[PDB]
Amino acid sequence: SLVYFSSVSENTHRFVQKLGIPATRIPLHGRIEVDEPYVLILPTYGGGRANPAGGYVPKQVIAFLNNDHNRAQLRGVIAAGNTNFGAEFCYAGDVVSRKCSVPYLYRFELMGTEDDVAAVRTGLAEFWKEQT
Amino acid sequence: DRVSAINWNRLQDEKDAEVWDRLTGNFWLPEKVPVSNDIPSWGTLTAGEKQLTMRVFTGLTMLDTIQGTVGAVSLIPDALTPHEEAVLTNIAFMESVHAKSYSQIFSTLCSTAEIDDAFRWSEENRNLQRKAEIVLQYYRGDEPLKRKVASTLLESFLFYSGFYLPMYWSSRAKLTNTADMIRLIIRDEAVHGYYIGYKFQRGLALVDDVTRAELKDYTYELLFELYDNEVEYTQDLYDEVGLTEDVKKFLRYNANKALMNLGYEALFPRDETDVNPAILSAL
Amino acid sequence: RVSAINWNRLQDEKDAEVWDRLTGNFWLPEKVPVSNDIPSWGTLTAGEKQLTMRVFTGLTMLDTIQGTVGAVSLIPDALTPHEEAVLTNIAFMESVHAKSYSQIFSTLCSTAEIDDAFRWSEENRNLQRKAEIVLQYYRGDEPLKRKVASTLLESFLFYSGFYLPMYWSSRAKLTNTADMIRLIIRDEAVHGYYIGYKFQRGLALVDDVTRAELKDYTYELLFELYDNEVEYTQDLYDEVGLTEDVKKFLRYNANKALMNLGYEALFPRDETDVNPAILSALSP
Ligand SMILES: Cc1cc2nc3c(=O)[nH]c(=O)nc-3n(C[C@H](O)[C@H](O)[C@H](O)COP(=O)(O)O)c2cc1C
Numbered sequence: 001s002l003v004y005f006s007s008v009s010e011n012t013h014r015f016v017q018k019l020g021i022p023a024t025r026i027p028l029h030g031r032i033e034v035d036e037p038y039v040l041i042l043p044t045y046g047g048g049r050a051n052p053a054g055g056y057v058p059k060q061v062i063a064f065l066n067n068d069h070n071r072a073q074l075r076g077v078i079a080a081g082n083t084n085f086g087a088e089f090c091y092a093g094d095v096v097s098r099k100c101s102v103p104y105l106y107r108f109e110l111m112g113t114e115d116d117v118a119a120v121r122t123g124l125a126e127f128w129k130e131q132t
Numbered sequence: 133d134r135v136s137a138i139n140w141n142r143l144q145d146e147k148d149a150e151v152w153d154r155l156t157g158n159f160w161l162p163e164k165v166p167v168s169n170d171i172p173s174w175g176t177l178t179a180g181e182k183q184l185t186m187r188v189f190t191g192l193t194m195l196d197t198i199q200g201t202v203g204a205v206s207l208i209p210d211a212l213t214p215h216e217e218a219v220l221t222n223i224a225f226m227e228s229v230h231a232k233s234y235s236q237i238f239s240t241l242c243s244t245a246e247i248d249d250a251f252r253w254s255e256e257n258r259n260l261q262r263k264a265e266i267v268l269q270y271y272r273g274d275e276p277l278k279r280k281v282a283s284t285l286l287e288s289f290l291f292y293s294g295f296y297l298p299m300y301w302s303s304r305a306k307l308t309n310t311a312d313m314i315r316l317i318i319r320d321e322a323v324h325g326y327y328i329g330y331k332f333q334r335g336l337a338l339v340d341d342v343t344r345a346e347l348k349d350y351t352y353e354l355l356f357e358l359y360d361n362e363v364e365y366t367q368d369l370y371d372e373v374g375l376t377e378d379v380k381k382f383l384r385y386n387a388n389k390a391l392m393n394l395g396y397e398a399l400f401p402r403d404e405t406d407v408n409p410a411i412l413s414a415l
Numbered sequence: 416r417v418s419a420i421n422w423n424r425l426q427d428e429k430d431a432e433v434w435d436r437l438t439g440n441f442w443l444p445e446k447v448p449v450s451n452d453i454p455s456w457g458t459l460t461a462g463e464k465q466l467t468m469r470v471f472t473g474l475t476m477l478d479t480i481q482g483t484v485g486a487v488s489l490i491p492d493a494l495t496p497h498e499e500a501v502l503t504n505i506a507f508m509e510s511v512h513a514k515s516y517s518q519i520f521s522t523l524c525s526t527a528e529i530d531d532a533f534r535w536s537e538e539n540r541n542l543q544r545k546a547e548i549v550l551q552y553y554r555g556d557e558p559l560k561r562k563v564a565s566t567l568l569e570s571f572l573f574y575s576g577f578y579l580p581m582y583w584s585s586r587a588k589l590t591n592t593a594d595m596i597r598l599i600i601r602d603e604a605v606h607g608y609y610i611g612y613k614f615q616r617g618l619a620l621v622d623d624v625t626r627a628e629l630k631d632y633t634y635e636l637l638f639e640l641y642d643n644e645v646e647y648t649q650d651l652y653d654e655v656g657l658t659e660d661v662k663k664f665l666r667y668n669a670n671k672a673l674m675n676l677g678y679e680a681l682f683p684r685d686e687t688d689v690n691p692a693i694l695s696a697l698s699p
């Protein structure tokens with residue numbers, strides 16, 4: 001399964017839609033819990049502080065991952081962002097990957113190109129086949 | 133008509149607060165980057181390599197002068213929220229900071245005669261003047277959605293024709309402190325392009341299907357018009373040093389990113405946007 | 416057509432001087448810890464609280480006008496490319512000024528208090544009138560009159576409200592809020608000088624007939640804005656009995672606005688002798 005977060009601009013939401021894999025969204029308001037394991041897809045958001053903790057992870061994601069039941073079933077993280085942010089490029093995946101035991105699977109920019117959708121589909125399929 | 137006092141305790145769009153916090157939290161001035169340490173690196177460049185860099189920098193300065201003095205301010209009446217107006221004033225100011233930082237680099241590294249030749253070049257170069265006429269036309273015209281497309285294409289595409297050079301020098305361990313300065317600019321442009329493109333999409337939702345289709349045609353028409361002109365601008369500058377084919381890859385790479393800011397899908401294939409990785413490592 | 420700005424050749428060093436000062440004084444409302452005023456704020460009357468919030472909302476409107484409309488409307492009338500850059504900074508800093516008041520409101524006041532304060536600015540005829548006056552010239556055609564209206568806003572209209580936070584500071588109340596306002600006044604002072612300075616330079620480019628028409632305009636617009644501000648002041652300060660002194664402060668700043676435009680002072684010294692406690696709060 002896939003768990004993704006996207007802000008009001010929904011660049012990440014539209015990428016998960018192009019993926020075609022069924023996935024559940026971390027709501028902009030409120031908390032949720034997941035049952036089946038999942039991979040996390042989130043964008044990166046610096047906040048004037050910059051310098052890559054330090055954040056970069058949406059607060060809704062922090063709440064979702066602060067859930068012990070939700071964090072336990074996390075398997076991997078894919079971060080979105082934009083290379084024009086220098087060292088902060090997709091650093092949210094670095095934060096989630098480092099602050100947990102999960103690996104850093106992929107990075108892409110904004111809605112992702114056609115190559116990103118094909119890359120995440122095949123990579124995520126071979127990843128799930130590995131867990132076994 | 134009448135204006136109402138801005139109440140930041142009632143936001144119609146949380147993105148305005150998010151963008152305001154990031155942009156103002158990233159406040160900087162050219163005096164913050166110590167360009168003086170680049171004096172040895174600068175002296176190692178050819179007269180032509182110096183000339184190429186100064187002209188590219190002057191071209192970036194014009195895009196900044198245009199976006200701060202005309203672009204951002206012209207977006208204020210098309211705001212969706214009063215806080216969007218406040219954000220736009222910050223963009224207008226930071227653009228002036230961007231344009232000034234190049235005069236800082238020039239003051240530390242270059243001579244007065246070298247600077248005069250650089251600014252004289254920007255006045256006479258038809259391609260640089262052409263891209264300015266194109267965006268200025270839509271900034272000063274009407275049609276608010278077309279203005280935002282032209283603005284987003286400026287922030288996410290037109291600049292990166294010149295952003296390539298400071299990244300190139302950084303990949304060669306030259307002008308590294310200046311690259312730090314330019315990196316601060318690119319970080320701001322990314323947010324500017326994201327925000328204005330985000331607002332463009334918000335305005336697209338308020339129009340009918342016919343208008344929406346007319347604007348998708350417009351974006352592609354203006355992108356290729358600006359791109360065809362940018363390739364000329366790129367060729368004349370980088371052909372001497374043999375970087376044109378890679379700068380063009382970088383151009384198509386960011387053109388796709390500019391399209392996505394406007395909610396549109398990427399256009400150029402992977403084999404046309406595979407810029408030399410050394411340049412991306414500088415990013 | 417536009418030309419890239421070259422900061423290494425200034426036609427007027429004053430642009431560089433003002434840019435350096437304004438950017439060197441950069442600040443954001445999060446820098447002033449208004450939370451320390453919560454005990455002080457609780458000591459004010461319901462009327463004193465409402466008076467303070469309305470005065471602040473009135474300042475917020477002036478800043479909203481000056482940042483989104485005022486400063487930007489001056490850009491096409493710039494004499495040098497660097498003057499334009501300065502104006503963008505003023506436009507941004509004005510938005511910061513208007514934001515700082517929402518900061519104070521967020522730390523000290525309730526939601527119902529804030530809504531009631533903003534609702535007042537919409538219905539108050541005098542506040543709306545002074546906004547209509549400056550907006551008319553901001554959006555108009557005559558650029559020299561636009562600079563006169565702007566200077567009167569920066570150097571005169573604001574100080575009708577700046578009086579109150581200085582009054583509280585002089586009584587050891589809302590001192591942190593006063594520190595915020597002092598940061599605002601530091602910017603306004605420079606703005607009025609700069610725009611008035613540019614107004615004077617623009618005056619030199621017209622004929623004596625036009626210059627005479629503008630002096631008539633300045634006194635006439637000052638008389639209109641002053642008569643309107645006294646109504647604004649009475650309705651606000653009559654409750655607490657501060658009107659007589661705020662009027663002194665009005666003439667005090669009206670003279671400063673006039674001199675920023677190169678014109679002679681209008682009110683005599685015996686009419687601008689504001690209580691020294693208020694003037695002491697403006698200075699360190
Ligand atoms: C305020 C702000 C800060 C951002 N900071 C970063 C960053 O530090 N690193 C990065 O790679 N992208 C950064 N981005 C880019 C976003 O991650 C990118 O636009 C992404 O597609 C947003 O996805 P979403 O639409 O689902 O929110 C930032 C964007 C905004 C608006």
Ligand SMILES: [Mn+2]
Binds near residue numbers: 231317321
């Ligand atoms: Mn810029």
Ligand SMILES: [Mn+2]
Binds near residue numbers: 227287320324325
């Ligand atoms: Mn920009």
Ligand SMILES: [Mn+2]
Binds near residue numbers: 602
């Ligand atoms: Mn102000």
Ligand SMILES: [Mn+2]
Binds near residue numbers: 481505509569602603
């Ligand atoms: Mn001001």
Ligand SMILES: [O-]
Binds near residue numbers: 192196
């Ligand atoms: O730039």
Ligand SMILES: [O-]
Binds near residue numbers: 474475478573599
């Ligand atoms: O103010």
